[PDB]
UniProtKB/TrEMBL annotation, chain A:
<comment type="function">
    <text>NDH-1 shuttles electrons from NADH, via FMN and iron-sulfur (Fe-S) centers, to quinones in the respiratory chain. The immediate electron acceptor for the enzyme in this species is believed to be a menaquinone. Couples the redox reaction to proton translocation (for every two electrons transferred, four hydrogen ions are translocated across the cytoplasmic membrane), and thus conserves the redox energy in a proton gradient.</text>
</comment>
<dbReference type="InterPro" id="IPR000440">
    <property type="entry name" value="NADH_UbQ/plastoQ_OxRdtase_su3"/>
</dbReference>
<keyword id="KW-0813">Transport</keyword>
<keyword id="KW-1003">Cell membrane</keyword>
<keyword id="KW-0520">NAD</keyword>
<dbReference type="Pfam" id="PF00507">
    <property type="entry name" value="Oxidored_q4"/>
</dbReference>
<keyword id="KW-0874">Quinone</keyword>
TrEMBL record, chain B:
<feature type="transmembrane region" description="Helical">
    <location>
        <begin position="62"/>
        <end position="85"/>
    </location>
</feature>
<keyword id="KW-1133">Transmembrane helix</keyword>
<keyword id="KW-0812">Transmembrane</keyword>
<dbReference type="GO" id="GO:0005886">
    <property type="term" value="C:plasma membrane"/>
</dbReference>
<keyword id="KW-0472">Membrane</keyword>
<comment type="function">
    <text>NDH-1 shuttles electrons from NADH, via FMN and iron-sulfur (Fe-S) centers, to quinones in the respiratory chain. Couples the redox reaction to proton translocation (for every two electrons transferred, four hydrogen ions are translocated across the cytoplasmic membrane), and thus conserves the redox energy in a proton gradient.</text>
</comment>
<keyword id="KW-0874">Quinone</keyword>
Automatic annotation (TrEMBL), chain D:
<dbReference type="GO" id="GO:0050136">
    <property type="term" value="F:NADH dehydrogenase (quinone) (non-electrogenic) activity"/>
</dbReference>
<feature type="transmembrane region" description="Helical">
    <location>
        <begin position="404"/>
        <end position="423"/>
    </location>
</feature>
<dbReference type="GO" id="GO:0005886">
    <property type="term" value="C:plasma membrane"/>
</dbReference>
<feature type="domain" description="NADH:quinone oxidoreductase/Mrp antiporter transmembrane">
    <location>
        <begin position="159"/>
        <end position="454"/>
    </location>
</feature>
<feature type="transmembrane region" description="Helical">
    <location>
        <begin position="309"/>
        <end position="328"/>
    </location>
</feature>
<feature type="transmembrane region" description="Helical">
    <location>
        <begin position="481"/>
        <end position="503"/>
    </location>
</feature>
<keyword id="KW-0874">Quinone</keyword>
Length: 121, 230, 395, 518, 99
């Protein structure tokens, strides 16, 4: 229990959104046009159906390193929440424990930063 | 031991989503579809964690795996492709059948080993969550499991070191700056000032269209190097 | 004590919790329909215009008119799109946006038709992180809309949405920690109750700033409206979307604005407690007035949003991410450490030692950040050499 | 509040703090000063770790042992023995890893004799990689990573609960996943090895965690002693206990390399940096077998009649497929990999003993075999093709001993030890495990191990034939002795393999005193 | 609904994850399948912890998620290096070491 209001609000939202998309597709004019249905390219003809030999199959991101670091850091930061909420109940022992853990995280972060890991985007 | 029929409904719908999501992860031939299916499965498992009297675990599941599947989607776009539809055709002679058999057998055997267990006593979690689910997790993590919590830092550091050593590219492979490019015998402008635009024709103005030289031939420079002519 | 208050939450009759959900839904709809018109009129004023003032009296219907127009408009489904995901993306953006707002305290307990119930749809032991999870799911709508549209500009917009997450997610998560630390809970009712003595904005100012920046980022609002970036990507991810699907994207963005501003109020501005000028007034925190105060604070955040739009360019998303990982994350992490040590010392009687630390720590941060700003980087200069092209003589 | 036995946890704490300090050295130390500090910081730390362990050994003289962190870590005699072994093997491994190139005419000497590519993020053979090699840059991040592995491998024997073992398994595996892909030459092979090892290690760790889940379900706790009390007390779910034991065994057997799970080792040991190959083939085997000893002698002894028959088969397969597959292997590195596969089964025989002699024999076997394997892989690293690539094809080794009698003799000693000929620690080692197995009722395993050793002696001996009994070919590989560190590793290792075979009672008394778990 | 059903689901999910690692060449897909196995283990821990009236398994799920994140990042690093050298993320292509 205690979650069924969240489910009611989610159900209201999902019905609202699904019916919204249905209205989008159903209400208003509809006329087939190959030009209308073609990709937007600022008015220029979009590439042939076979976009090109190779072509935009793969998109490099310049922050792959920061994305990888984000994975680990985001997961590792969730340990703070139980520590934060249990603070004043765990005592100085936990304070020192998390200070050491956060210093370890800081060392990781400083190694990443000072060695240019955060720079290429 | 039978949990509330509401929990039954939640399990059935959500675990249906989770099982279908895993199946799509394995079966979807577009990697982006597989990523989305993984996100669905993670969300469903988070819902199950909440339903099993594990609020914080489920919520953290949603959060962290939203992040994780976003990054895995980025890496799918980088390393695999934007909408590449992989063949999924067995390349190792008979490997597909052997893998299906082994997976099914392992699943059947694990189900057999699990068998009926809950009938042997299912102590609800209320006595534990009382006082705060997160409070209980904090009590355990920083009291009994403090050493493992500390070693998670080693895991994090090792991941960072691996990323930096294998992924980060030092100065030698650093891409030249726009500032750098403009320089060096006035690069990028001395040379075909701004390379000639693709040709514009009636019925064809796309970038793949090569421009026409005075004699009527097609200028190779007008069309980019990467395009497959036209 | 153990929030959510078990004597208040989880005991609504089915119809009453249905009505509270319906009221929250209608409130969010009217709040978005307001925010649209109010933002346009306030931007006009900040640019010396009147903004919309014709459609209906005083231009009231302009937001409603735009919504109905988008409804009455052709439902486009371009060829070359992943039809399923292309149609789902607005739904994935919308549902979580509405869901997140469920655990937002719009008031204290009130006796509606005898039933004592909160002016709040419900509350959870981990409510704040539940909002975070809903908002994080919502970004899948943006990213999958960008990707599924099968066009270069939507693709770039969706990639910018992914980068946007990589920038703001960790900063937001860390910004929550200090509030949890002073509150001793993750429920929003508990976080508001813990603010009876004083609002955490004064106590947790660094956390407030980090959270607000990560917020403006999370909603994709200027100067971090990068996924759209109409000046660069035309329409970003919501290119190729028209009619109610685009309308749903924008409604999702505005509901995210409302949700995150309501959270900011909840966990930094005493939630629904009346401001200082009405703090001393009798019953200012009882009955329906708390709803007025909550809406007032939320709309001050809305004003901050509009003001940011009207007075800042948009960063390049790499610059924004460098902000997040070089300023927001380090600052939030060091603030969490400093606040933890401060509370531990105060609980151990050290007293002044904490004040010397706290004040000093920020004083150090305010320096080193400026170090990354002007005193050590981003304030240098250089020269360059000429080429063979017979360049003139620079006086 | 929790009570932390710092004196007990001292070795692991020292190693992990040293790893953190090494990452700091990478973070805020200038390039030219990084390597001198790291090799300084690493080796000293491990030496300190060694020192710590011996004092901890003195600490456990009276009591059999003690837990440290409210369970989750128990320093008992087997734990300190395995931790000391891993510390020594780590010292040797880091002496191998720190070996720099043999400065010929230029100052570009940069940790290349260690076989580490100057910039692992670069495309192999790219102009960037070539320019980095010319500039003599080294990714010193290796030293912390290695240390982290040791830290994990120090804990993994000493972990006293499922969660700590799983965390330690990941902590030791991830560094090795990364290290396997940093080789200086044959970079394609090293990268493939890293990918294979990561994929299969992640698979095995998934099995490990799922088995931990099943054991926890059966027992209602994840401290090993609690699991033992549950299974012995008969209160828990026996079927779940068995399934969890099996799934956990899957992971631990992957870590040691049993035949059903060994397939990675040939490729990974071939393609990984020779230094990292030497380091891992000892350290990971030691840590995995220590953990498996703990699980089968602390966590789940009562279910012996249930898991004995399984290990039996595995051991059989391990000895047979591991040895037979090696008979016709033509690459020295891959042959040593299959030799390690076979010796995993040899160890597993003494684990199957399920008696104190089993533990003593296993500990001695791990010590002696880890040392011997580390030495053999270091020697295989010393042999070079004319192009610089480590010559590993057995044909190029013809007459290698004749051209280099000292290294030939040392490598022949290592091979004889692996075969288990007497006067080598390898004999005493195999004898101990076989004696434990027979005394434990597993004589048939002793017979099968006898047969497997007879088969393996052939491929151990063919290499000696190539070294000494054949004239060197026209293009014989030369012996490069990059630095005195590698020489010290080879000398210490061979000297151990020989002394510990002639007069093994030292360290065999210590193995005996480490026959009981807490 | 018998709580044991969750375990079956976990068993199924792990199974599918296992099958994925055997059937899909793309290294990213393999990583997602490994994540599926780890999450199935988490589900088993959560159910068992609910059964035993203690949060231990819920704690273990956190550490499993941490390990999953670190493993995924390490695999991503290895795959990035391999992709740079080869421009392919297929595991089958890493076949040089054999026999």
């Amino acid at each position: 229990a205690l979650y069924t209001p969240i489910l009611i609000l989610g159900a209201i939202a999902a019905v609202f959104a699904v019916v919204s998309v249905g209205i989008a597709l159903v209400i208003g004019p509809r006329r087939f046009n190959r030009s209308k249905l073609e990709a937007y390219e600022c008015g220029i003809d979009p590439l042939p159906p076979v976009a090109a030999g190779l072509t935009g199959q793969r998109i490099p991101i310049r922050y792959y390193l920061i994305a990888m670091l984000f994975i680990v850091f985001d997961i590792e930061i969730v340990f703070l929440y139980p520590w934060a909420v249990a603070f004043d109940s765990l005592g100085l022992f936990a304070v020192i424990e998390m200070l050491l853990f956060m210093l370890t995280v800081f060392v990781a972060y400083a190694y990443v930063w000072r060695r240019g890991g955060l720079n290429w985007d | 031991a039978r949990t509330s029929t509401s929990e039954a409904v939640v399990f059935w719908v959500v675990g249906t989503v989770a099982l279908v999501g895993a199946i799509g992860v394995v079966a979807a031939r577009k990697a982006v579809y597989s990523a989305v299916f993984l996100a669905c499965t993670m969300i469903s498992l988070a819902v199950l964690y909440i339903a099993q009297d594990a609020p914080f675990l489920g919520v953290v599941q949603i959060v962290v795996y939203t992040g994780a599947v976003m990054m895995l989607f980025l890496f799918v776009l980088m390393l695999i492709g934007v909408d590449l539809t992989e063949s999924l055709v067995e390349t190792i002679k008979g490997h597909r059948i052997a893998a299906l058999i082994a997976g099914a057998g392992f699943g059947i055997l694990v189900i057999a080993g699990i068998g009926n267990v809950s009938v042997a006593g299912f102590s609800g979690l209320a006595a534990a969550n009382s006082g705060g689910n997160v409070e209980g997790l904090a009590a355990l993590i920083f009291t009994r499991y403090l050493w493992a919590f500390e070693l998670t830092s080693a895991l994090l550091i090792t991941a960072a070191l691996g990323a930096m050593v294998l992924a980060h590219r030092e100065r030698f492979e650093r891409r030249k700056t726009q500032r750098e490019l403009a320089i060096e015998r006035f690069q990028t402008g001395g040379h075909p000032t701004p390379l000639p635009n693709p040709g514009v024709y009636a019925r064809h103005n796309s970038v793949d269209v090569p421009a026409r030289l005075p004699d009527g031939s097609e200028s190779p420079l007008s069309v980019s190097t990467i395009l497959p002519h036209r | 004590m153990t929030h959510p208050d078990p004597t208040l939450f989880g005991h609504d009759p089915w119809w009453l919790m249905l009505a509270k959900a319906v009221a929250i839904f209608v409130f969010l709809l009217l709040t978005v329909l307001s925010a649209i018109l109010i933002e346009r009129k306030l931007l006009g004023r900040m640019q010396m215009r009147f903004g919309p003032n014709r459609v209906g009296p005083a231009g009231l219907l302009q937001s409603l008119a735009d919504g109905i127009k988008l409804a009455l408009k052709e439902g486009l489904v371009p060829a070359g799109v992943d039809k399923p995901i292309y149609l789902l993306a607005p739904v994935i953006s919308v549902i979580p946006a509405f869901v997140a707002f469920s655990v937002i305290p719009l008031g204290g307990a009130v006796s509606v038709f005898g039933h004592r119930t909160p002016l709040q749809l419900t509350d959870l032991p981990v409510a704040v992180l539940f909002i975070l999870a809903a908002t994080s799911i919502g970004v899948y709508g943006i990213v999958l809309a960008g990707w599924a549209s099968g066009s270069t500009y939507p693709l770039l917009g969706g990639l910018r949405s992914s980068a946007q997450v990589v920038s703001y997610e960790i900063a937001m998560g860390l910004s929550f920690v200090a509030v949890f630390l002073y509150a001793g809970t993750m429920s929003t009712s508990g976080i508001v109750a813990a603010q009876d003595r004083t609002w955490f904005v004064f106590l947790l100012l660094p956390s407030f700033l980090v959270y607000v920046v990560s917020m403006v980022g999370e909603t994709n609002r200027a100067p971090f409206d990068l996924p759209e970036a109409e000046g660069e990507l035309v329409g970003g991810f919501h290119t190729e979307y028209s009619s109610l699907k685009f309308a749903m994207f924008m409604l999702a963005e505005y509901v995210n604005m409302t949700t995150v501003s309501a959270l900011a109020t909840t966990m930094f501005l005493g939630g629904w407690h009346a401001p200082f000028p009405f703090n001393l007034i009798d019953g200012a925190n009882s009955g329906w007035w708390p709803l007025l105060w909550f809406t007032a604070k939320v709309w001050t955040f809305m004003f901050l949003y509009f003001w940011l739009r009207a007075t800042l360019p948009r960063l390049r998303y790499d610059q924004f991410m460098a902000l997040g990982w070089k300023v927001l994350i380090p600052v939030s992490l060091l603030w969490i450490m400093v606040v933890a040590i401060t509370r531990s010392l105060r609980q151990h009687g050290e007293g002044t030692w904490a004040a010397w630390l706290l004040t000093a720590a920020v004083v150090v941060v305010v320096a080193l950040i400026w170090g990354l700003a002007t005193s050590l980087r981003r304030r240098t200069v250089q020269p360059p050499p000429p080429q063979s092209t017979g360049a003139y003589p620079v006086p | 509040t929790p009570s932390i036995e710092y004196g007990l946890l001292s070795p692991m704490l020292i190693v992990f703090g040293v790893a953190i300090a090494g990452v700091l050295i990478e973070a805020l130390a200038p390039r030219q000063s990084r390597y001198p500090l790291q090799v300084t910081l690493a080796l000293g730390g491990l030496i300190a770790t060694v020192v710590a362990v011996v004092f901890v050994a003195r600490g456990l003289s009276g009591t059999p042992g003690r837990p440290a962190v409210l369970g989750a870590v128990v320093l008992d005699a087997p734990a300190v023995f395995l931790q000391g072994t891993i510390a020594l093997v780590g010292i040797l491994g880091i002496m191998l890893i720190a070996e720099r190139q043999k400065a010929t005419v230029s100052a570009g000497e940069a940790r290349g004799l260690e076989d580490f590519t100057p910039q692992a993020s670069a495309v192999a053979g790219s102009v960037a990689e070539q320019l980095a090699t010319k500039t003599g840059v080294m990714q010193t991040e290796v030293f912390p990573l290695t240390m982290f592995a040791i830290g994990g491998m120090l804990l993994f024997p000493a972990a006293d609960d499922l969660l700590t073992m799983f965390v330690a398994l990941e902590v030791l595996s991830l560094p090795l996943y990364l290290l396997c892909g940093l080789a200086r030459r044959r970079r394609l092979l090293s990268q493939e090895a890293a990918l294979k090892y990561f994929l299969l290690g992640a698979f095995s760790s998934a099995f490990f965690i799922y088995g931990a889940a099943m054991l926890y379900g059966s027992a209602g706790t994840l401290d090993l002693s609690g699991i033992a009390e549950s299974v012995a007390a008969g209160s828990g779910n026996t079927s779940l206990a068995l399934l969890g034991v099996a799934l956990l065994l899957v992971g631990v057997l992957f870590k040691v390399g049993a035949v059903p799970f060994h397939s990675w080792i040939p490729d990974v040991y071939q393609g990984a940096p020779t230094s990292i190959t030497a380091f891992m083939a000892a350290a990971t085997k030691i840590a995995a077998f220590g953990a498996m000893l703990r699980i089968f002698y602390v966590a789940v002894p009562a279910l012996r009649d249930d898991w004995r028959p399984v290990l039996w088969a595995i051991a059989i397969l391990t000895m047979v497929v591991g040895t037979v597959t090696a008979v016709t292997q033509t690459d020295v590195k891959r042959m040593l990999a299959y030799s390690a596969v076979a010796h995993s089964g040899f160890i597993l025989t003494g684990v199957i003993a399920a008696n104190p002699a089993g533990v003593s024999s296993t500990l001695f076997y791990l010590f002696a075999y880890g040392f011997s394997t580390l030495g053999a892989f270091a020697v295989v690293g010393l042999i070079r093709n004319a192009a610089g690539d480590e010559e590993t094809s057995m044909a190029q080794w013809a007459g290698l001993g004749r051209r280099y009698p000292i290294v030939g003799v040392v490598f022949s000693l290592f091979l004889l030890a692996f075969a288990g000929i007497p006067l080598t620690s390898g004999f005493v080692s195999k004898f101990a495990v076989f004696k434990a197995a027979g005394e434990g009722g597993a004589i048939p395993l002793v017979i099968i191990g006898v047969i497997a050793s007879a088969v393996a002696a052939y491929f151990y001996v063919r290499v000696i034939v190539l070294m000494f009994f054949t004239e060197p070919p026209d293009d014989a590989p030369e012996l490069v002795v990059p630095s005195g560190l590698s020489t010290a590793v080879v000398t210490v290792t061979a000297a151990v393999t020989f002394a510990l075979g002639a007069l093994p009672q030292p360290l065999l008394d210590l193995a005996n005193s480490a026959e009981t778990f807490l | 609904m018998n709580p044991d059903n969750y375990l079956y689901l976990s068993a199924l999910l792990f199974t599918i994850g296992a099958a994925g690692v055997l059937l899909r060449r793309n290294a990213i897909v393999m990583f997602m399948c490994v994540e599926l196995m780890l999450n199935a283990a988490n589900l088993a821990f959560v159910n068992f912890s609910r059964m035993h009236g203690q949060l231990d398994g819920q704690v273990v799920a956190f550490f499993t998620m941490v390990v999953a994140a670190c493993e995924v990042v390490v695999g991503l690093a290895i795959i990035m290096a391999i992709f740079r050298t080869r421009r392919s993320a297929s595991v089958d292509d890493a076949n040089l070491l054999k026999h």
